[PDB]
Amino acid sequence: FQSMSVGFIGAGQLAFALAKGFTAAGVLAAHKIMASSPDMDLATVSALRKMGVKLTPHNKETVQHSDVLFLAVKPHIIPFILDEIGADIEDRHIVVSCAAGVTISSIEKKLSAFRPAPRVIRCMTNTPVVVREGATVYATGTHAQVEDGRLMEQLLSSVGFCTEVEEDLIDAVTGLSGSGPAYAFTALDALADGGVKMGLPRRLAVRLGAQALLGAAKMLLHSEQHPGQLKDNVSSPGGATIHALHVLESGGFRSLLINAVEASCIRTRELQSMADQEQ
Amino acid sequence: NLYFQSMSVGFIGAGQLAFALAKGFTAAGVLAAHKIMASSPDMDLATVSALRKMGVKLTPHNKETVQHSDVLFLAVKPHIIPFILDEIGADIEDRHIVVSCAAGVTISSIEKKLSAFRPAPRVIRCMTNTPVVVREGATVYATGTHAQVEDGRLMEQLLSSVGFCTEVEEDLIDAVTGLSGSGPAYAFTALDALADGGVKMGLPRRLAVRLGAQALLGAAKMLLHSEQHPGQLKDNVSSPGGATIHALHVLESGGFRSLLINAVEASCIRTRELQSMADQ
Amino acid sequence: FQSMSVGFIGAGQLAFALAKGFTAAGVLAAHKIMASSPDMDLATVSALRKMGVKLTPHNKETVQHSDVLFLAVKPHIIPFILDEIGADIEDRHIVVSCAAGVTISSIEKKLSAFRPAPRVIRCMTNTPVVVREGATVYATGTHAQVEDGRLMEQLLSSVGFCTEVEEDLIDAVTGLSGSGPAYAFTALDALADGGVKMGLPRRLAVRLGAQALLGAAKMLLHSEQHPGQLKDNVSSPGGATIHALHVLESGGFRSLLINAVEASCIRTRELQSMADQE
Amino acid sequence: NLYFQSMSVGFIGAGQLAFALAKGFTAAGVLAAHKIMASSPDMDLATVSALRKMGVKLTPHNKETVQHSDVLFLAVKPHIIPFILDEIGADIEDRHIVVSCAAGVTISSIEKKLSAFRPAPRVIRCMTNTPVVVREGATVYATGTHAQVEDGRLMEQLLSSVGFCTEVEEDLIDAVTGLSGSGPAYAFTALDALADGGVKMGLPRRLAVRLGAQALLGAAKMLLHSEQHPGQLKDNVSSPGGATIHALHVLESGGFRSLLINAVEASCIRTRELQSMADQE
Ligand SMILES: NC(=O)C1=CN([C@@H]2O[C@H](COP(=O)(O)OP(=O)(O)OC[C@H]3O[C@@H](n4cnc5c(N)ncnc54)[C@H](O)[C@@H]3O)[C@@H](O)[C@H]2O)C=CC1
Ligand SMILES: NC(=O)C1=CN([C@@H]2O[C@H](COP(=O)(O)OP(=O)(O)OC[C@H]3O[C@@H](n4cnc5c(N)ncnc54)[C@H](O)[C@@H]3O)[C@@H](O)[C@H]2O)C=CC1
Ligand SMILES: NC(=O)C1=CN([C@@H]2O[C@H](COP(=O)(O)OP(=O)(O)OC[C@H]3O[C@@H](n4cnc5c(N)ncnc54)[C@H](O)[C@@H]3O)[C@@H](O)[C@H]2O)C=CC1
Ligand SMILES: NC(=O)C1=CN([C@@H]2O[C@H](COP(=O)(O)OP(=O)(O)OC[C@H]3O[C@@H](n4cnc5c(N)ncnc54)[C@H](O)[C@@H]3O)[C@@H](O)[C@H]2O)C=CC1
Ligand SMILES: O=C(O)C1SCCS1
Ligand SMILES: O=C(O)C1SCCS1
Ligand SMILES: O=C(O)C1SCCS1
Numbered sequence A: 001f002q003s004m005s006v007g008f009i010g011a012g013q014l015a016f017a018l019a020k021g022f023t024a025a026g027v028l029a030a031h032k033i034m035a036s037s038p039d040m041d042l043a044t045v046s047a048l049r050k051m052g053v054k055l056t057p058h059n060k061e062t063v064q065h066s067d068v069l070f071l072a073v074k075p076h077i078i079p080f081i082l083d084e085i086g087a088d089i090e091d092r093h094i095v096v097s098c099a100a101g102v103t104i105s106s107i108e109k110k111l112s113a114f115r116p117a118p119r120v121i122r123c124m125t126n127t128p129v130v131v132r133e134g135a136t137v138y139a140t141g142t143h144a145q146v147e148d149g150r151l152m153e154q155l156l157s158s159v160g161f162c163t164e165v166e167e168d169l170i171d172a173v174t175g176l177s178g179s180g181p182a183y184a185f186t187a188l189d190a191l192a193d194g195g196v197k198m199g200l201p202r203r204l205a206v207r208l209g210a211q212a213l214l215g216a217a218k219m220l221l222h223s224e225q226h227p228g229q230l231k232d233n234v235s236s237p238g239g240a241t242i243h244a245l246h247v248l249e250s251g252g253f254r255s256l257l258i259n260a261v262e263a264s265c266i267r268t269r270e271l272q273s274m275a276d277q278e279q
Numbered sequence B: 001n002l003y004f005q006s007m008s009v010g011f012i013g014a015g016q017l018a019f020a021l022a023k024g025f026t027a028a029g030v031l032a033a034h035k036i037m038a039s040s041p042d043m044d045l046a047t048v049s050a051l052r053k054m055g056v057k058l059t060p061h062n063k064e065t066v067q068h069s070d071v072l073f074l075a076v077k078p079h080i081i082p083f084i085l086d087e088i089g090a091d092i093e094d095r096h097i098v099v100s101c102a103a104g105v106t107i108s109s110i111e112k113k114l115s116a117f118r119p120a121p122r123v124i125r126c127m128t129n130t131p132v133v134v135r136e137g138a139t140v141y142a143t144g145t146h147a148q149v150e151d152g153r154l155m156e157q158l159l160s161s162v163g164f165c166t167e168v169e170e171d172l173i174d175a176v177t178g179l180s181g182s183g184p185a186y187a188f189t190a191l192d193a194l195a196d197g198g199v200k201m202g203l204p205r206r207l208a209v210r211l212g213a214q215a216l217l218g219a220a221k222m223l224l225h226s227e228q229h230p231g232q233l234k235d236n237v238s239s240p241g242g243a244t245i246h247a248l249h250v251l252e253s254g255g256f257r258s259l260l261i262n263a264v265e266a267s268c269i270r271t272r273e274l275q276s277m278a279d280q
Numbered sequence C: 001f002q003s004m005s006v007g008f009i010g011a012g013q014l015a016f017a018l019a020k021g022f023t024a025a026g027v028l029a030a031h032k033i034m035a036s037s038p039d040m041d042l043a044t045v046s047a048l049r050k051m052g053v054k055l056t057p058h059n060k061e062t063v064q065h066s067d068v069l070f071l072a073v074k075p076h077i078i079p080f081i082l083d084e085i086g087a088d089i090e091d092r093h094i095v096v097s098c099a100a101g102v103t104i105s106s107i108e109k110k111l112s113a114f115r116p117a118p119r120v121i122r123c124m125t126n127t128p129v130v131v132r133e134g135a136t137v138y139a140t141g142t143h144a145q146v147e148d149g150r151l152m153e154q155l156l157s158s159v160g161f162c163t164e165v166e167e168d169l170i171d172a173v174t175g176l177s178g179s180g181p182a183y184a185f186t187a188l189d190a191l192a193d194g195g196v197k198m199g200l201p202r203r204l205a206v207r208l209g210a211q212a213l214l215g216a217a218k219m220l221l222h223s224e225q226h227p228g229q230l231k232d233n234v235s236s237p238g239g240a241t242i243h244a245l246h247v248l249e250s251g252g253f254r255s256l257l258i259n260a261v262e263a264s265c266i267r268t269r270e271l272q273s274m275a276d277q278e
Numbered sequence D: 001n002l003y004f005q006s007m008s009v010g011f012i013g014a015g016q017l018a019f020a021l022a023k024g025f026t027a028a029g030v031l032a033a034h035k036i037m038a039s040s041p042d043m044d045l046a047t048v049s050a051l052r053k054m055g056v057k058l059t060p061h062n063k064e065t066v067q068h069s070d071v072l073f074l075a076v077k078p079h080i081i082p083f084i085l086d087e088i089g090a091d092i093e094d095r096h097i098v099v100s101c102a103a104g105v106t107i108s109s110i111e112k113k114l115s116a117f118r119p120a121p122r123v124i125r126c127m128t129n130t131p132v133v134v135r136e137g138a139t140v141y142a143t144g145t146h147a148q149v150e151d152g153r154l155m156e157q158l159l160s161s162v163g164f165c166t167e168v169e170e171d172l173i174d175a176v177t178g179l180s181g182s183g184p185a186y187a188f189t190a191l192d193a194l195a196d197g198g199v200k201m202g203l204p205r206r207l208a209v210r211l212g213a214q215a216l217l218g219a220a221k222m223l224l225h226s227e228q229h230p231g232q233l234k235d236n237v238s239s240p241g242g243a244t245i246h247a248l249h250v251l252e253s254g255g256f257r258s259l260l261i262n263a264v265e266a267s268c269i270r271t272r273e274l275q276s277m278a279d280q281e
């Protein structure tokens, strides 16, 4: 009953996932969302159009429509966008940057040249908001009101987990839960290949592997136990599971997942350093 | 609005799986805890103490469980199954459906033991996993020689209340064991390691565990609810030149995919090997 | 393109591949093509002569002859070429650089010293244009007219896939489809060795492996499905294919192909940095 | 072409291969979809749906497919073949050509089953692949003891309509399985990974997939049309000091060639071992 108007600058995968999640949650009407993109011939744009989201090529129209304005363009596009519509940001706006790596400081520096106290929030979310099981963190900017952070948390909690963090954690969150779903999709493809190798039909192997991962993740979320203790409860002495865990260990399975989180976090920091030098 | 008002369930064995299934069934509301009985020779077990708190009836005597129950879950270690069947075989009656949850143990071996006492024992073999405790298990089952059509439908109805459940041919169950039976342990290992990675890059451990588990849960749900290939969903996360595709490369460089294939294979092979030792 | 005259500065592998492709496509007459090289005794020069292309040692003759001018020399030779013929570029010319790494900016700066508004196109293609199955991208320069891009796409679409890109994608394209045929030739040699190890005659193993790769690539191009889904359709449970896919995975096969695209792209960027520093 | 004038074709099994062959045969125009019949127990498959839309006649009864067809393709999983041969063996007649597509299954095992019913079953063993669906398959076949001369000629003409086809001795078919039978899956894996490499270096995924597939198709076509060795063609791409030779080094450092040899070998060996388990049983 808030009747919030939401805009997305950028009408790609994340704008679609968030719009789909918000509308499935019943927090927003699809036609109260407006998204802009210069390439109005993407599949994401077509899917947004079918949902009933309003679409325009003009970023200024998205700004003027919006109360909450999500920045959902590639990180290197954010400064061009802030130059373009910075004069259109109003005191009523909450600007939510979803761009990987882009700092609140960089955004406020651009926008403060126009109005003195732009309300900026930075978030890192992930594509599972599309099924309302996202993992979201956010940090509040210099001029964001206490009510702004609470509004953001309410909105993003409707599509998954949401919590406030200090901004200096967000690049690490990006490497864990931002990139996380891609590690899981890779793992599920491989587990299914394993099931197929041992004689299962592919359709059944995909379903079983995905259900196994979902159930295990839910167990851990609902348990106060260490993941190692939960692992111990699966493995009977001499049994099949502990034999399988040994071959994972012999390949350095754990180290590969640590490598992945690190690589994603470092690349996030490295891109932003490139961005800050280009300014 | 499901409820089996005339069904008494028993567990021979009162360990991790018996607890998980009993907790799942009671949370589902399809069974009252007092209609469940579990037996174990060790009544000083953490799982036994937990089943007590739920209201499950406990006894040291497997014969008591058999006499109380209609649906009888065998939830003991695989090498104990033949001793259990020798012990209570004379107590199996026409009304009993015997559901073996033991990894690897064949319908054939169970029916041969029980048929020495009374012909036509109704046997079902199932492979489930511990997430039935949060009603997100993955279960397959195969029906035995003398199981009636209504027996398998009833068991699918019961096991569907605590997660995914489908009928399979028995010769797929050892492979299912390697995938979704052992799968939760692969996930717990992966979540421990992902959290270590989060901590390495500066996150508090509690938050890293929560975010990693939420990421895995959400991705699995996305795939279950999508008609798209996991590779296509992966492509939607990875923007060109971005952080995710850099991370995917280092996974590939370590043969990440091959390790998970190795694991499913190793668990399946061990399951087959253990049963061959049992039958020899 | 009946009135169109095409020239190649540099008469080596790529010039032959494009001229053979163009003439087999019927979009160009061989006698309307001229190519120049210093060493008129190269094997590519002789093959070009056999198909009816006009040949000359003088790059200025090529320029005076043609409307569309392909630069098909090694990348470090481009600046020397642009200095030699810059004064002969006219308003009618479309200069198409095929050189790996070389930027539109560097070409326009050299040519603009002689005449303002040179019409420049940068492209990255590959050798399979010789069988009209090339993969080509192009970027239009500052002063290229809109019809210039449409003309180049029409011409290069006759010898394979062709699409316009932003210039900052071209170094990555170079690592993928520019170098890609070499990855495929390596893979085909190895697959044939595998067939021979298992008892096939070499000639048959080469033919079968190449047919397999061609068919699979065509399947993917004509399908809406993800390559992973097509892989799923081949491998039956417990079967020979999924066993072989495992051994590829155990060697990090996917990671090696990622390494290759990366290494070729990085080397391309590195070489242009040395050119721009010089 | 009088071979196909009035010929009817049947598929026992209605999965990926049956759809790929039926699609290729009809696209080639060598066969009308209504002259093709397929049978499968579970009509709940996706491939059974597509075959319906093509105009292919479907039925659950394998005996009906046998009665309809002159050329009978066996397109079921290898371990089902002896069960199928028990079921329809008394229905195989003199006029049938039985074409086994099952991996590993020997002409000998098929002829042993069918010869218990009628003395001279005409059997052909083939190994094809899924790109017949785009008429670019790679097919080999071996002729059985009782296959007539025109039988192999008929088979060759039919399978040549959807790609390369040549006759081989049967002892080569397990190795062909490891090379061109499994080969498309190696290519699909390689294209997925090449596209990941394009994406890592900044390309949109859609363009990376298109460029990688076009590169592989073009290189394969080049080799098929050239008399030159693959290494000489590789040499023509690599300029001294250039990007390609740098990329080839990193492939070599990972043993890229050996992985592909490993794959052909592993598929060939699994094919041999599947059959040895079948004939022991
Ligand atoms: N996809 C994911 O998994 C997640 C993405 N993100 C972040 O969200 C942002 C976008 O992510 P995707 O949606 O995956 O990118 P995407 O590339 O799918 O969509 C990007 C959109 O930006 C549009 N665009 C380009 N220039 C524009 C301009 N000048 N004005 C307006 N729109 C313009 C493009 O047309 C495209 O529609 C990135 O910053 C990424 O870091 C963060 C968390 C997860
Ligand atoms: N824990 C898991 O992840 C799953 C286990 N299973 C199967 O379930 C069965 C049990 O698994 P867990 O519960 O993990 O074992 P567990 O070891 O936690 O509990 C085993 C129970 O058997 C009891 N027991 C030993 N001898 C007995 C006897 N003579 N009579 C009665 N009870 C006796 C023990 O006291 C204990 O309560 C095994 O066969 C295993 O393969 C299958 C799927 C998943
Ligand atoms: N071979 C390939 O796979 C592809 C090559 N390219 C690019 O095309 C260009 C050439 O490729 P290749 O034809 O393989 O080189 P190549 O070395 O086969 O032929 C190069 C030609 O340049 C000639 N040349 C040298 N100095 C000259 C001068 N001062 N004036 C006129 N001609 C001169 C040489 O005599 C030779 O004929 C390079 O820039 C390369 O990056 C791009 C894509 C694919
Ligand atoms: N898909 C491929 O890449 C190629 C497959 N092959 C061979 O072709 C055969 C099947 O290939 P796919 O089509 O991939 O198998 P698939 O499993 O996709 O379809 C197999 C068909 O057999 C049917 N079937 C099972 N039992 C049956 C019965 N009793 N009567 C009639 N139909 C029955 C199934 O319903 C299914 O339609 C296998 O032997 C395989 O080795 C060989 C070359 C390539
Ligand atoms: O504990 C074990 O190893 C068996 S029970 C879970 C899957 S296999
Ligand atoms: O493009 C990317 O990889 C960013 S968006 C998802 C997490 S990081
Ligand atoms: O699917 C399989 O593994 C067999 S059928 C294609 C070649 S081998």
Ligand SMILES: O=C(O)C1SCCS1
Binding pocket: C100, C174, C178, C179, D237, D238, D239, D242, D243, D244, D245
């Ligand atoms: O020869 C080379 O390495 C360059 S030109 C073709 C791809 S990159």
